[PDB]
Enzyme design. Structure first.
Site, short mmCIF file in Angstrom:
data_model
loop_
_atom_site.label_atom_id
_atom_site.label_comp_id
_atom_site.label_asym_id
_atom_site.label_seq_id
_atom_site.Cartn_x
_atom_site.Cartn_y
_atom_site.Cartn_z
N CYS A 50 1.34 -14.00 7.74
CA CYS A 50 1.27 -12.64 7.20
C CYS A 50 2.24 -12.42 6.04
O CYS A 50 1.90 -11.75 5.07
CB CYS A 50 1.50 -11.61 8.31
SG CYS A 50 3.07 -11.70 9.19
N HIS A 163 5.19 -7.99 12.35
CA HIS A 163 4.17 -8.20 11.34
C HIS A 163 4.75 -7.82 9.98
O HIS A 163 5.76 -7.11 9.88
CB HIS A 163 2.94 -7.33 11.65
CG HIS A 163 1.77 -7.62 10.78
ND1 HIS A 163 1.24 -8.88 10.64
CD2 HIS A 163 1.02 -6.80 9.99
CE1 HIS A 163 0.21 -8.83 9.82
NE2 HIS A 163 0.06 -7.58 9.41
N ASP A 181 -3.22 -4.30 5.82
CA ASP A 181 -2.95 -5.30 6.86
C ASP A 181 -3.66 -6.61 6.54
O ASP A 181 -4.89 -6.68 6.55
CB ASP A 181 -3.40 -4.72 8.20
CG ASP A 181 -3.01 -5.57 9.38
OD1 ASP A 181 -2.66 -6.76 9.19
OD2 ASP A 181 -3.01 -5.01 10.51
#
Ligand SMILES: [Ca+2]
Ligand SMILES: [Ca+2]
Ligand SMILES: [Ca+2]
Ligand SMILES: [Ca+2]
Lengths: 220, 219
Positions: A50, A163, A181
């Site tokens: 991520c 995250h 995201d």
């Protein structure tokens, strides 16, 4: 005591692809960053990448001179596959380590800075919700700079651990930020209340033993 | 901002103030939201059609094939799109990697995943019906539009290309192409007449015109 916890709350997210979520983009007046980020949006290549996906979205949005990609030559862009071409980047944290454990907030900042790009790392413990909201909303109105957040998914009602993703817009009327995201196989972009995003950043990452938080990135 | 090629002035880049305003003043832009969520770079210079297809199939929420890295999650990717014999029987991935795909092959590849596809060669319709039918789709959730067009006819380098459409701006009569060659060009707002001319070109492979495809769920 003991606390009887009569009123308990769970975070409420609004999806970008909902009618309301679409309206929040159109009624935002802090959304300059949405357009370039949307042009660069990518899926993290594995379930640990991520931060890498987030970084390359921002570097490409800033027009940072990029490594060669033979498949695209003569055109060049940052990709998750070529991001570690710079040895200084690998020296922060190696790609095989990121692929197992991800990256901390401080590593995120150092990885960006290894390309000579200007960064300001803000751990939640060193700031406050009011300064976060104000400074990030200002950045979202400004071209030439971007914001990346690091947060515990659990605290915004998702699953589960830490995250990283860019922010694209702030809706003033609802006090919500749009998270682009990069786990696109799992969740859509969401509009999150500032108070929930703050709570999620104001958590301690056991890898760093420091809070999560947010990073400002700009071109020198 | 990003280092893509300078656009010919008949095009308005999404990467410009005016290009942003055309989205904000469009009344035909529902498809922009899911398509932007799925926007991807074609993985090689021949895979524009594959990238376009997966954007649409992911936007429709179709059950997807197994992936290399996301298990248990699934999405369409440029690596798993050909993971069944029916899809490969339309056209082999080895060929798409060298030659791309024609409009008819694009349609059949999409249809191999069970969704509803209508293929419209430009020769079989007219500019006014193209504009009306596509603008209507762009207001509607649950369906999408992909175009196949000769880039040179809209001012770009160079040959036949494939990408989804995301919006239509009424005041300027322009469509937004979500160009999957993201390393080369941004999304662009193209005049209907330019896009029409670019679709109304003969692809030498098929000796048929280019055109557009409507995609929706069969259910
Ligand atoms: Ca809608
Ligand atoms: Ca701007
Ligand atoms: Ca900014
Ligand atoms: Ca539609």
């Amino acid at each position: 005591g003991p606390h009887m916890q009569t009123l308990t709350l769970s975070p409420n997210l609004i999806g970008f692809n909902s009618n309301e979520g679409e309206k929040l983009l159109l009624t935002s007046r802090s959304r300059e960053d949405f357009f370039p980020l949307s042009m660069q949006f990518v899926t993290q290549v594995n379930q640990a990448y991520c931060g890498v996906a987030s970084i390359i979205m921002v570097l490409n949005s800033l027009g940072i001179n990029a490594p060669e990609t033979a498949q695209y030559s003569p055109y060049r862009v940052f990709t998750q596959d070529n991001f570690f071409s710079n040895e200084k980047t690998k020296a922060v944290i190696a790609p095989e380590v990121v692929a197992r454990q991800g990256m901390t907030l401080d590593e995120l900042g150092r990885l960006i800075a290894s390309y000579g790009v200007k960064v300001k790392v803000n751990h939640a413990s060193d700031t406050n919700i009011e300064d976060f909201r104000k400074q990030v909303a200002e950045n979202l109105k400004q071209d030439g700079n971007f914001v990346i957040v690091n947060y515990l998914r659990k605290e915004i009602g998702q699953e589960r651990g830490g995250h990283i993703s860019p922010l694209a817009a702030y809706n003033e009327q609802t006090d919500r930020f749009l998270i682009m995201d990069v786990s696109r196989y799992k969740y859509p972009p969401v509009w999150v209340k500032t108070t929930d995003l703050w709570k999620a950043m104001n958590t301690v990452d056991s890898v760093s033993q420091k809070t999560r938080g947010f990073v400002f990135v700009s071109k020198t």
